[model samples]
Target: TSEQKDLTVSVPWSVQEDLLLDVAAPLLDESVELGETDSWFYLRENHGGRPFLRLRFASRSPSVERRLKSRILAHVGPTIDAGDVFTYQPYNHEHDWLGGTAGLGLAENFWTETTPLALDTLRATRGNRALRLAVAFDFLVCTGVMLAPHLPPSIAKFGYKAGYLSYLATFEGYMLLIRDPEGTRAKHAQRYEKNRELLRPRLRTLVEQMSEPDGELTDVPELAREWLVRLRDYVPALQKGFDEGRFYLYATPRKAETAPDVEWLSDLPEPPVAGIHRAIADNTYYQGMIREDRRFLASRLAQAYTNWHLYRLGFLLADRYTLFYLIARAFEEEYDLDAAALIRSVRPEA
Candidate 1:
């Protein structure tokens, strides 16, 4: 019975006319002819000389069907008309490929435990350790959002570009506060490249050290100390920016508080003014999921950090199709690590 059912409906003439005039007309070349039968209307030519999309109507009340058609025209119509590049199938293909990788246990753990380890190391250093960790964690989360596969390609591209620029600008603004306390915003823009280069290697080294299973703990603090020293000069200005609402933090909710001594991450004043604000408090799942115990934190953080890194790297390469693949690999590695750790825990006869 299901196979025999005819899933087709006759479209109203008005809607058919609207689709041709408003939606499809602009996309078709002059040579194409718009034709209609009693039940359907279509372009005689394929889209860009390739097979085009076919429209299907459902049996509904006139008003409801009209409304549905209007909504489709307003929302999805533009994307369909844009070009082959904006088609749904290609993006879907990429998403499926990435999902398969993640499912297959083939992802890499490039920076596993790096962020948590960095936080642990920083906790022993002088300065606002919470604020520092907050910044790093915010960056990680924002990177995840920028790489989210659910977004349409057009939107995703725009969001990623905007987010990355904002990330760089915000960090550079802090650097300027330290380098030139009285500097204008334009001056910070000028020094962004240099500051980024200076910070990148330091960050890369710190992350690499954190990735080592039996790495020297002392090096972690030493590197953190050096990084903190570079950041220390601007810390007060950064704190001021946070307090004055000049800085913003992502993934942080309102009504969260930070320590008074280092309250740079605290929420804006009551009846919060309309503007971006720093996330002083962590309201993410990780905060609740991972305990304060070093081993537990390290294990959980590694899993999360690896996933984040895989997605971010995939996004940057414009090859998010590989994300799932990398995720699958990471899971396999994690399972192996867990099994090995469990075996090591049990004592065997000598």
Candidate 2:
């Protein structure tokens, strides 16, 4: 009876992209030369087009399921050692002649071409603390819901919800990569340097924080919580600028090769510019109005509760260990994340 229920978890697109790259980069080194036609390498040619890997599950109990989930996490960095990702498949599409999909092909190149290479690379590297931490953070954040079961009641009583807010937050973050030209294109040398600077420190901290032994988190929830809380705060400043309609000013021109050079300045139509300005103003005004509205606030509270409830239940069912592949597929499609390989990895193969 318990085996009938399923759990689905959603991972953000950018984070997923990182996972694929970590796995694919090493694979590429072995089997394929990285170049223009290489799908994985080109996946990021556009702005904000990061891909994610999805994971799905059905479980009878949490412990047994987590054991299976851990295997995939453990393989990420080791797999990266093998070859570069030369292909990619979209989340649920059929596998075609080109190795499933463009995305999945690249994804598979890593696993198939370079598995032994990656494993050996890990041994030479003396162990991958950073990659391991990243995998852990992903597993926890993406899989948080199933850790608890009595979530419905908790959400109903607390008036808190989960899915949409997290989804919105994730999407908003993804949009930043697109809308923030300096970030997306990284055209200017300074822009590239600055973007890397901002990203590097945060990633370093994340790797440091998450890599701590599992037993350590129990004693250090405060410190861990602090790191995430600070991370949460830092994101809103970047988010606010975009939300406030100042995003257009920050757009970076695409790379020199791909983008055309324009004269001193580009012209904007009066109507379109004015329309955007007005829309921005109206949007902010409405947001303020809703924040002040008691009914709206109550609804948000209710939603938050429900979100937490669903998250917990989902986590439990996920531990069941069935339909692992399908759940991963659903999540990839729902969020436009790239989880092609994980989806396939879970299926019964010929």
Candidate 3:
């Protein structure tokens, strides 16, 4: 009997934060505000002055502390004052009034505020084509393994393998997309087109095999061989996109804010006494900045992929349908991404 399994998986604070913001932004009309207290980072609104949706570090964990600091700085450093250094402490049990045991109150508050927002956003975005496609993609691939038990044994095995492959490809695809910011969308589309072209025959064959009345599990290895060949052809494109940038400029202080009055120097024709000046906007600086921005984007993107991979791994291990239902419902309420077409294109039979 197939049943949903229960499991616990640890996720980074930043991932949770991103999820909350993703759901909160559309419903709140983009008025969501973020702030930090001594021991917690929080989100709230100025208009309503509602309760803070807060998060705190787990107690006595240096790794958690380090991760929180790095993640926060990577995200907000550009928009914030350069001199500021954010800090946090373990969830203090003594201060139950502040949040509750281990700052569970904050977690409770966060979900309470954002769950409704997520549902509402799902409702509103149902008609959006891009979102519908994205959600459908997520549902099919992310929950591919969960659907296996209901499928025939041979198809079940192939589905599991395909799901894993697709999951990895999705991450690699994202990395490539962000590798070149200037033409990210165009590059991503090119990769997709290439994948569709290369995989069509193999997928068609796999679908045909699955349609057979007594499709042998032994037939899957042949499909896997062809799949590997497709990936072999696809690897170079991925490598082209995996390239990175040089050093990133984390902060640059404005002269007006950090130095003595420079306005007076405009009147003086000759170069004034020696003082700090902005770096020349030469090729070196431009290239460095470009590299730095790309690096940051890559790092953030990698972290997001890693977090999601861990989540999927947990589901795979436990055979959980909880996340499957959640994701499927989100897509169902919004719009179907023509799953029938997807099945016809790649399943055992048309």
Q: What are the C-alpha RMSDs, in order, of all predicted structures?
A: 25.6, 23.9, 24.3
Residues 1-350, model 3: lDDT tens digits:
22211111123433333433543223233222221111222222111221112333222324433444444446553654424332212222222122224333433333333334333434544446445333333333323332233333323444444343324334333444455633543444454555454334533444344433133324443323232233223223222233422212233343387646767857765321111011212234323432433332332222232233333222221122222322323332233333222222332233
Any runs in candidate 2 off by more than 4 Å, and if so which? 1-131, 134-224, 248-255, 259-350
Give per-model TM-scores. Answer: 0.19, 0.20, 0.20
Indicate which candidate wins on lDDT.
3
Ranking by lDDT: 3, 2, 1
Q: State the displacement of the C-alpha of residue 324, model 1, in Å, after optimal TM-score superposition.
A: 28
Q: What TM value does model 2 have?
A: 0.20
- For lDDT, candidate 2 versus 3, the one ahead is 3
Model 3: CA > 4 A from native: 1-57, 61-146, 150-191, 200-350
Query: Model 3 Cα displacement at 300 (Å)?
Result: 26
Q: What is the C-alpha local distance difference test score of each model?
A: 0.30, 0.31, 0.32
